[PDB]
Amino acid sequence: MVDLEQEFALGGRVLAFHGPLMYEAKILKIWDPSSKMYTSIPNDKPGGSSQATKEIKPQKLGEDESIPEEIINGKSFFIHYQGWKSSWDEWVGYDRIRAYNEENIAMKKRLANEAGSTGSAPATGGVKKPHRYR
């Protein structure tokens, strides 16, 4: 529709590309190197929260999170992976995640064709499949 869709929107969708395939995501707590601390809003209820609260004050990170120096130094987004478990509630860097827009849909649809299978085999297929790992 408009160019604005390309920007992260604090309660828009984001799509996040893991490597073989990509999934739906939804921002709520976000991060920037300018203060190396985050900010958050009541946009969901993670799998270990009563709810996210109103205009959450910046606090030092690492109460339940981890971010490598790869996404510390850049824009980052704590998200609920949609159609998926709350176990995956994590942040991604803007190298893997992007705000819901037509370019990401072209990615989505290409991958939804080339690799659109469940990965329910002893070879993982192309899916993050949490059922077992080592």
UniProtKB/Swiss-Prot annotation:
Disulfide bonds: none annotated. Residues 54-63 have a biased composition (Basic and acidic residues). Residues 39-53 have a biased composition (Polar residues). Residues 39-65 are annotated as: Disordered. It comes from the Eukaryota. Residues 13-98 form the Tudor-knot domain. Component of the NuA4 histone acetyltransferase complex which is involved in transcriptional activation of selected genes principally by acetylation of nucleosomal histone H4 and H2A. The NuA4 complex is also involved in DNA repair. Present with 1890 molecules/cell in log phase SD medium. Component of the NuA4 histone acetyltransferase complex composed of at least ACT1, ARP4, YAF9, VID21, SWC4, EAF3, EAF5, EAF6, EAF7, EPL1, ESA1, TRA1 and YNG2. This is Chromatin modification-related protein EAF3. It comes from Saccharomyces cerevisiae (strain ATCC 204508 / S288c).
